Design a protein around this ligand. Structure first.
Ligand code: FES
Ligand code: FES
Lengths: 222, 32, 64, 29, 159, 169, 32, 34, 279, 279, 169, 29, 222, 159, 34, 32, 32, 64
């Protein structure tokens, strides 16, 4: 991983002396991509690319977006209109949400049609499905943040379906909405989930997933 | 804060009594 | 598990194959290389007398 | 007995006791 | 490119291959061949394609939320089109929620059910490819149904 | 007598059970915190508010509608409840909660047909709000509508349409 | 609302990716 | 042309341009010939 | 007509729910289409071909009673800043395509929304609306972005007047459960049907209950002669900044070239690695 | 006095900056203190000892230009819900300690804020304010929590009347540059200094510029006889729920016991490990 | 020949230089985005508002505050600018910006002293706003005031206190 | 040349080209 | 790390067949605490404890706190009064910010007085200083969130300080304030920094710090 | 606990100890002695003491922010008391800023300057303990000065 | 006592109870049997 | 659009020309 | 504002922790 | 450089030491144990004739 020039440089020797960074190089270089791997094994990684764009542009939109029922739509139209390149950042964010979910579906098709999930990699698939759920949760929580007609009514519909359970469902609806009715509490809670809870949940699930693929490696040849 | 000092003495005496009671009792029943 | 350069006889064929490959069944061929197979087993490419080198699962072929 | 005094003495006692349990468990400081 | 050959003489690689792992030990080098050079080709492909889709088809500022007026057609994101159709068409709400929850848990059960067979190739997994292709056609049919009216949702107005 | 598995597991039950009791004591305030405060209001007569933040005056409404169409106003549990005029002079004593029961799409009122007609999935209701047809299993909830300030109270008596105990109560 | 372009990209990529994974599978499954 | 048509045409162009992607990469591989 | 929409709801044809007011009176629900470009550069005349497709041979009950041809109108609610291109901005080709169609704003200060109609349906199965996109450069209020274009296109007569009465083109229904004691024409197509509540129907639809069968409240007394219908189609048009696409093309060409250079650097490292393996 | 604050700024003694109105006319600054408990249970009479320390032998100039004793007042701004305990609620110790000090609310509907004074400083170097904490349980508006208790404590005569004139207890200064002329005792002790602008000063201050030195605008003409000053001290009082501390004491005893049991399980595993090493 | 270190590093310069140009092209919109948009092209004639945010009319301000009093009104750069009356008839044509120059602490006005007196560190200013004393090196910024609507324009002309170029300009 | 066409063709070309550069670099699919 | 009982159970045997979890146990058990370590080496760990409380209670206060200038103070007094145990959660959070900084100062005193920073652990100390800066940034961004008087004016003062830089000061002030003046843009930006940017920065710096501690181990005996 | 002794025969441990590392290879076991048992003792101590400080001394809802009225005495958090005083006492603002930034950057250089001496014990590095005790007393003095008027800030009213 | 009084006495209580904790845990070490 | 297919063809053709110009050029100067 | 209790705990712990670390250091430094 | 049991003789004292160690300068001892000193050094406990064992740095002692 480190070329001879970097290995001999006194700076790298300093780092090697203290943190033995060469061991990282050896671990990265020991791996090999088997011949059976093809372009479709890129899809999982592209699912991460779309997430990292979503991580960056979301960080961009937190600086201007105001998660309030009086200011959320005005702040989203401010991002679009007034903010410099806020049209680009918001459009890229919507498009990378759709492309993250599409790349994820294609990745589940690759995995499934290559037997990636088969023993010993059952837990990688299960953490996968959890990741997928977390991503659809990101999509739902985000859809409602603009507090536009489409978003507000999508959260109205989806958050009221837990009511189907006779007794417990009412409590789940009051928890999801954070109030008896979709309102300011629902927007504060969906925003806290979207921008804080769910990035940490999907980052813990991404670390679990990538640690299990690193340990076990890639699946065998078809 | 004389009463507070009394309560502090009482807390350290109660808890040290519980600690040594538990330690010697468990050692007696050969748990520890 | 399987010796390289070892004559083998194909007792069974796991998968449906073209007629030519089925002709290879029961023919002695010196294994020429090891190919990783579907089940992560070590399958063996088999070079037959006619030189139609076709890979086979280790389960299929039997050491000769 | 003053509840307020017991409230402050519980926190002071838990600070003392956590220090004493850490030096007891580790068998020294 | 130089391709490492699996060093099968090594008993450690043979033991790993027995368990299904150890395929990251042979083939082309991971770094820098694939990770350093080829991965940024896909990262830049995706960044450029998402930026081009954003520029060409920018996001649309909708209308301000009116709690008193429900849009004639309210729809979720496209990935929740089959999830949403299930809700509307199934009469009992509770079976709808059972189906919505049965999608992810059934997916979580895919590996345990299917690992009876060891063969990863789709052509050596007949029943699993039958269930998968039927379920993919059913999820695409439900997703397409979500957009349609509730009267013509189940037939896509085709018949 | 070196502690065997049984004694070690009993001491693990003692220690970690007490730490689990302390953990549950610390977690209970957090869980109760995340549960929204039960401060919806009185839970009885919640004055019907206008679409705008201002609370709608009964008389001002009685001088605005002109009997053309049914109007909506924030209701119990924050669901827009129709306020019928039924003669213009005095609002009807009952207000039909205009939230479809199938999923919660606010049902508009088609005064041409004299029946609510939800566009969301097409669940019809009559003037009283009973489901004449459509996926919606239950009927639209009713509320009390006094002519005084307006107070909206859940329909505690048997509804006069289906003549059964109100599901919403 | 329905985004037609996005569903065009979706209905285009899903079947071409499935066809290509079944083609890669068939070619690996083939015996030369 | 219209946004609505990009549902159908956009899907076929995708199918069309993925394989034309694939194929052209092979063309480059064949053309380079080294 | 479209001007009774101006009268009934002068503020805006579209409600907050997104239901154009046309539906409040045109009860049937036929199709409708708009062929608006996925994107339009600023200050450029384009065309929005509003298809209002109804069967040509179908005939509808004219107000008098005798069947006749349908007409077609529409309310094309363009985004903010858009309007109908003036004739000078129109090209000769679009001068021909549009023809002599009169387009009027739903109200002054609302030029974006345009109400065509009523037009004879035989030759207006497709109404080309010549739009002129705004320039965000000139007008600060206008910005570049995707904007919604809502159409309400209707063919045939309505069912309910602005007065609230019911037109002859409408399936009448029973006021009360009263036996039909009398049914008479009096050299006309109107039928004074007979709780035995005496009701009158005009000379539009033919009776399905002409017999002396008893009637119940709500049951349709006549067939529905409405062969037309209102439809609404919400689309989107991206007011695109040309500079955005110039810099996009430049950025994507940079990415393409960098990908070429990435594959060539991989070729170089592969050559080095192949020489390293050789001994 | 304190009632000139009621008149000048009836709404509230404290400004938005947190500067009590006292300072606007009591220009000097001396120390002020409040001995309020860190926490007070609900519905409990406690004491707030407002210390207003000034040198007791110090003598101020009085309205009539005659040295004399200072007085001490204060504006104790308690939190919302708090008040002055009524005489019935007072204990005998606090009944006698407070004595006959009259405490009045700064205004009706503002019982929390209390004004005392003017009181002879000789015997009121410390004014015990008998407070009565509110019960959040009985009063929904009031809640348990940490709250701010502001204080104002003037210890001497002001310098400027509500009329806007200047009191004799002040360092008078030059209006304009001139030179003193025909200096005399205009009043009983007042003076008439003389641009030669005739200016008058009261008897209180003593001239520092009585000599025939030239005068400049804004130059202090006399000594400052102000021996007192106003001070303000913002503190805090926690209206504590007793149940909060009951459950706190129980939770912390749980933690203490669990820590004991953790050390005991470490002892057990140390024994297991020590015997495991032995063979 | 096998690419030597120099050749390898030149091809690395080509590839990663182009990827750094593409990265900078993608990063520039992000950095410009994070930079807040300018409130307006020119910060001139900034109608004086209030802390509550309502626009402050010159006439209403004149009616209140009598004469020789100072009241803050939101001004240029969103800093409260005192508006002098100096006769209760026409507001002075200048409005001292009551923001301490060295810090941000808003400076109150003591009409009794005829001198600004900042409480944070005691930085005083005279009636005109000039630095008389205290740790603040620069003086309070000035603006125009119009007696006819109230607008505050960046005071660009030489200040009439120090008779030097405005520091704030 | 329509700039809208050139923008759509640039995005389409970058999708084709990224697929072709990934199969070229990796030497197959 | 796994007892004899957990090991050999079919469940642990399953997880160990797949992911080789036994290696984690071996690595955790291989380490030893040298005799010189004492109670003061606890302080850095307690700095993490105070951070984790701040992570949890901060997650709690995101569900109710509304980062708007009209609603931030009302939402903080709603957390205190109305929300269940919101007084406790907010008071614990305020107290754990002070105790995190205090534990960090006491941990800097331990480290510096134990020579922990000396070669080879120079980079652990430098990432330490980075952590410290990030924690004080958490304190500053948080202090202003209630949008109370002390908070608003503390952000006014601190955010106007960069103005003193001769050439680029004004743009840094406009950047950190997000507007010409402290206002709604400054509260949206301080909240985005507080609840999103700074938790990710301090989590990357905490992971770097703990990885360098683990690789290098603890400092030598004094 | 029975304490492992450093196996100095091992050349790997000797090499690690030469470089300053390898002190996590001897002493009492890390797990479960310290990690499992003692760490939760400190975690529960801190959680209980923070909960008790929160309950006994809850947070104060201040007054709502007034942009027009500056609090007489605005102060930051206690940890920025020494920094805040730096700002106000120094006449030139830019010098104050340079001091504020010199605190963290000056800290970042501590290891590089100090590593000249290999000894870790404070009593074996006199100059470093002199500079450290002077700097801790100066930071506590600045912090205490921050809480006084600027007139009596530098003397704490003592002189 | 008062909130303001808790600065000095609280600091002395901290020093005192830190040293008393150390002492009492050494006491507990001795009170156990080795 | 037919104009779009013409521009697409031109785009691809030029990029193939640059990729292979660079490939054979760098191979010639031996950089590859 | 000044929190006197918090400042008390800070000024109590800082010097007791410093003294304790200098005592630990002296005890390691001194030779038995 | 040092092993257990090895007779040693302290010749220098890096740090300041108590009177006992002053006397121990130039004394004969036998190594008793291995101290872990600061600087990550391998110290050595030394049992002298006095019978009191004192730890020393590696540099201090002279193997003999
Ligand atoms: S929600 Fe109205 S019909 Fe379903
Ligand atoms: S900012 Fe004005 S005196 Fe400090």
């Amino acid at each position: 991983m480190f070329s001879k020039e970097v290995t001999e440089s006194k700076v790298f020797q300093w780092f090697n002396d203290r943190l033995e960074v060469q061991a990282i190089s050896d671990d990265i270089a020991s791996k090999y991509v088997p011949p059976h791997v093809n372009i479709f094994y890129c899809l999982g990684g592209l699912t991460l690319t779309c997430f990292l764009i979503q991580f960056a542009t979301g960080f961009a939109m937190t600086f201007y977006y105001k998660p309030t029922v009086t200011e959320a739509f005005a702040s989203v139209q401010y991002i679009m209109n007034e903010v410099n390149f806020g049209w680009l950042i918001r459009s890229i964010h919507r498009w990378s949400a759709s492309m993250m979910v599409l790349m994820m579906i294609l990745h589940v098709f690759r995995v499934y049609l290559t037997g990636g999930f088969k023993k010993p990699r059952e837990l990688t698939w299960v953490v996968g499905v959890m990741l997928a759920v977390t991503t659809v949760t990101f999509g739902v929580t985000g859809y409602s943040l603009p507090w536009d007609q489409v978003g507000y009514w999508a959260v109205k519909i989806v958050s009221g379906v837990p009511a189907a359970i006779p007794v417990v469902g009412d409590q789940l609806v009051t928890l999801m909405r954070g109030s008896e009715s979709v309102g300011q509490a629902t927007l504060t809670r969906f925003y806290s989930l979207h921008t804080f809870v769910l990035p940490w949940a999907i980052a813990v699930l991404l670390l679990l997933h990538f640690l299990m693929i690193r340990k076990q490696g890639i699946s065998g040849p078809l | 804060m004389a009463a507070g000092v009394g309560i502090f003495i009482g807390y350290i005496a109660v808890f040290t009594g519980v600690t040594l009671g538990l330690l010697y009792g468990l050692r007696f029943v050969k748990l520890i | 598990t399987i010796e390289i350069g070892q004559k083998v006889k194909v007792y069974r064929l796991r998968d449906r194959v073209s007629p030519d490959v089925v002709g290879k069944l029961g023919k002695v061929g010196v294994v020429k290389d090891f190919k990783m197979t579907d089940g992560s087993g070590i399958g063996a490419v088999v070079s037959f007398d006619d030189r139609t080198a076709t890979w086979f699962f280790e389960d299929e072929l039997k050491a000769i | 007995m003053d509840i307020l005094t017991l409230g402050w003495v519980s926190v002071l006692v838990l600070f003392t006791w956590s220090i004493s349990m850490v030096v007891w468990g580790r068998n020294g400081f | 490119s130089i391709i490492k050959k699996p060093d099968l003489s090594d008993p450690d690689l043979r033991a790993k291959l027995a368990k299904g792992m150890g395929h990251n030990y042979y083939g082309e080098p991971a770094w820098p061949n694939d990770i350093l050079y080829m991965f940024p080709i896909c990262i830049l492909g995706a960044l450029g394609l998402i930026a081009g889709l954003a520029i060409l088809d920018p996001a649309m500022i909708g209308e301000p939320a009116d709690p008193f007026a429900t849009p004639l057609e309210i729809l979720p994101e496209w990935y929740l089109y089959p999830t949403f159709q299930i809700l509307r068409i199934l009469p009992n709400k509770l079976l709808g929620i059972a189906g919505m929850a049965a999608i992810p848990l059934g997916l979580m059960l895919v590996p345990f059910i299917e690992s009876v067979n060891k063969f990863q190739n789709p052509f050596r997994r007949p029943i699993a490819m039958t269930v998968f292709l039927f379920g993919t056609a059913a999820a695409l049919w439900l997703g397409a149904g979500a957009t349609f009216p509730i009267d013509k949702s189940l037939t896509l107005g085709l018949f | 007598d070196v502690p065997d598995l049984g004694r070690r597991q009993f001491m693990n039950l003692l220690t970690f059970g007490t730490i689990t009791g302390v953990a549950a004591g610390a977690l209970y305030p957090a869980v109760k915190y995340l549960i929204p405060p039960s401060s919806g209001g009185s839970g009885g007569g919640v004055t019907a508010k206008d679409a705008l933040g201002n609370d709608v005056k009964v008389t001002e409404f009685l001088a605005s509608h002109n009997a053309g169409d049914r109007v909506l106003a924030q209701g119990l549990k924050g669901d827009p409840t129709y306020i019928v005029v039924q003669g213009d002079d005095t609002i009807a004593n009952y207000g039909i909660n205009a939230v479809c029961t199938h999923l919660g799409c606010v049902v508009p009122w088609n005064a041409s047909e004299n029946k609510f007609m939800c566009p969301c999935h097409g669940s019809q209701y009559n003037a009283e709000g009973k489901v004449v047809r459509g996926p919606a299993p239950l009927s639209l909830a009713l509320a009390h509508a006094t002519v005084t300030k307006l107070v909206l109270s859940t329909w505690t008596e048997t509804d006069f349409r289906t003549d059964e105990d109100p599901w919403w109560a | 609302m329905i985004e037609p372009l996005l569903l065009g990209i979706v209905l285009g990529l899903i079947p071409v990716t499935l066809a290509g994974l079944f083609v890669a599978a068939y070619l690996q499954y083939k015996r030369g | 042309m219209t946004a609505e048509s990009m549902l159908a045409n956009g899907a076929f162009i995708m199918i069309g341009l993925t394989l034309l992607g694939l194929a052209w990469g092979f063309v480059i591989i064949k053309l380079q010939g080294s | 007509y479209p001007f009774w929409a101006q009268e009934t709801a002068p503020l805006t044809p579209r409600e907050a729910t997104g239901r154009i007011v046309c539906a409040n009176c045109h009860l049937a629900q036929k199709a409708a289409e708009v062929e608006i470009p996925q994107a339009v550069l600023p200050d450029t005349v384009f065309e929005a071909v509003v298809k209002i497709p109804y069967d040509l041979d179908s005939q509808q009950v004219l107000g008098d009673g005798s069947k006749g041809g349908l007409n077609v109108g529409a309310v094309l609610m363009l985004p903010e800043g858009f309007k109908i291109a003036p004739p000078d901005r129109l090209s000769e080709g679009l001068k021909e395509k549009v023809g002599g169609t009169y387009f009027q704003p739903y109200r002054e200060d609302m030029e974006n929304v345009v109400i065509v109609g009523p037009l004879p349906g035989e030759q207006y199965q497709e109404i080309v609306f010549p739009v002129l996109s705004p320039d965000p450069a000139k007008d600060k209020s206008i910005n570049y972005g995707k904007f919604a274009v809502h159409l309400g296109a209707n063919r045939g007569r309505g069912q309910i007047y602005p007065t609230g009465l019911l037109s002859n083109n409408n399936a009448f229904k029973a006021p009360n459960a009263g036996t039909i004691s009398e049914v008479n024409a009096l050299e006309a197509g109107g039928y004074q049907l007979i709780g035995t509540e005496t009701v009158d129907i005009p000379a539009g639809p033919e009776l399905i209950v002409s017999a002396g069968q008893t009637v119940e409240a709500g049951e349709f007394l006549t067939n529905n002669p409405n062969v037309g219908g209102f439809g609404q189609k919400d689309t989107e048009v991206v007011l695109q900044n040309p500079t955005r696409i110039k810099f996009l093309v430049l950025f994507l060409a940079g990415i393409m070239l960098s990908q070429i250079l990435l594959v060539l650097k991989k070729k170089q490292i592969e050559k080095v690695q192949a020489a390293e393996l050789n001994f």
